[PDB]
């Protein structure tokens, strides 16, 4: 009851994987509910999040044209559908999920197992969807 | 949506409520509401009156009662952020943040202090980000 989104992101995502970034944002407007970052070239922006939210909801295939832009970095898409987008930049992995109302995204540090990242993000997405979030 | 699930699954799990409502403070637009055997539906008009009163002249609640769902609560505490009332064995707690109005009332005999804690903690969550 009444816990902060920042605590939730830090706990549910960032304590479970070695992240370069982690963000929970609103699916309508790309408004950041909470985010954590390590040393990104640029801060994650509302614009970046709105573009992702709009794309995953309207045309996930669109990520094949130009990639996935977050934190001033470009990830090349490896999977795209309405609920799940995955990409890679070098040995860093990105996983993005859409629930009813939010977008969840996290990218790992170079070399961290992508499968762990994906499982954590996707499990948390599922939990949230089951609670109507 | 998410607000209705929050009310049902969180607030109403931790408080035995006769009613709960989350509303916009500026227009009294309902984000989510729950009702258990109220005489009438909670209306935007009821919410707008409360929003206006808690913001402008909270002493107005002593004058005009607190009207929700066709029920009348009698005010026991009033300031700009927090209004409390009673009707029989039922307690009402109302909180205003910058942009939201929160209200819940208990079923007969449920601890008012739990009511107040839950409502007030949700107000705090919102005020933490200036909502």
């Amino acid at each position: 009851g009444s816990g902060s989104w920042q605590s939730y992101v830090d706990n549910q995502i960032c304590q479970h994987v070695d992240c370069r970034l982690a963000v929970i944002a609103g699916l309508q407007d790309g408004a950041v509910w909470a985010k954590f970052e390590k040393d990104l070239p640029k801060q994650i922006t509302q614009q970046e999040l709105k573009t992702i939210a709009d794309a995953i909801r309207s045309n996930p295939n669109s990520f094949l044209e130009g990639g996935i832009h977050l934190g001033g970095e470009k990830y090349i898409c490896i999977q795209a559908d309405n609920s799940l987008v995955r990409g890679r930049k070098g040995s860093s992995a990105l996983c993005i999920v859409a629930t009813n109302t939010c977008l969840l995204a996290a990218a790992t540090v170079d070399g961290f197992p992508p499968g762990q990242l994906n499982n954590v993000v996707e499990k948390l997405g599922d939990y949230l969807k089951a609670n109507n979030y | 949506g998410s607000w209705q699930s929050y009310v049902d699954n969180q607030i109403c799990q931790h408080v035995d409520c006769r009613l709960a409502v989350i509303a916009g403070l500026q227009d009294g637009a309902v984000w989510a509401k729950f009702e258990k055997d109220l005489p009438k539906q909670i209306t935007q008009q009821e919410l707008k009156t409360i929003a206006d009163a808690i913001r402008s002249n909270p002493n107005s609640f002593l004058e005009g009662g607190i009207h929700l769902g066709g029920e009348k609560y009698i005010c026991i505490q009033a300031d700009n952020s927090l209004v409390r009332g009673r009707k029989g064995s039922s307690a009402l707690c109302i909180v205003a943040t910058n942009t939201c109005l929160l209200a819940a009332a208990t079923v007969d005999g449920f601890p008012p202090g739990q009511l107040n804690n839950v409502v007030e903690k949700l107000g705090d969550y919102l005020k933490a980000n200036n909502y």
Binding site: G1, W5 | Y6, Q10
Partner: peptide, 6 residues
């Protein structure tokens, strides 16, 4: 504004 985490 979003509700708290479930």
């Amino acid at each position: 504004p979003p509700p708290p985490p479930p």
